[PDB]
């Protein structure tokens, strides 16, 4: 599984990212990949809020959330998709752990 993790505080600010799995995956361009994926996650979905905002609102009320697939474009024109799941964790202050899973197919 090609993925990366984020941690957000309860304002939704990202306070860390873990790219260890991407760096072990043997492909170049993972920095561009992570930026592009995050930016796609945070983009307004037409008239609806971004998946980031939808997941944040849901996870803070109900403790878990999941996005459908969203697409983004690497610098060389390569089209990928990802989806995101997250979880409110009570350890310290409470934080939101998110996993972002890449589909290359």
């Amino acid at each position: 599984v090609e993925s990366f993790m984020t941690k957000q505080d309860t304002t939704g600010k990202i306070i860390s990212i873990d790219t260890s799995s991407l760096r072990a995956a043997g492909r170049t361009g993972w920095e561009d990949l992570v930026r592009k994926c995050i930016y796609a996650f945070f983009q307004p979905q037409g008239r609806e809020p971004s998946y980031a905002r939808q997941l944040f609102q849901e996870v803070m009320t109900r403790g878990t959330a999941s996005s459908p697939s969203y697409r983004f474009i690497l610098n060389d024109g390569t089209m990928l998709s990802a989806h995101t799941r997250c979880k409110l964790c009570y350890p310290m202050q409470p934080f939101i752990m998110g996993i972002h899973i890449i589909d290359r197919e």
Binding site: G12, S16, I17, R35
Partner: peptide
């Protein structure tokens, strides 16, 4: 509030 380019540069080096 989305993360800016500088927000991500910081997270990715830290």
């Amino acid at each position: 509030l989305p993360p800016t380019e500088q927000d991500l540069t910081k997270l990715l080096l830290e």
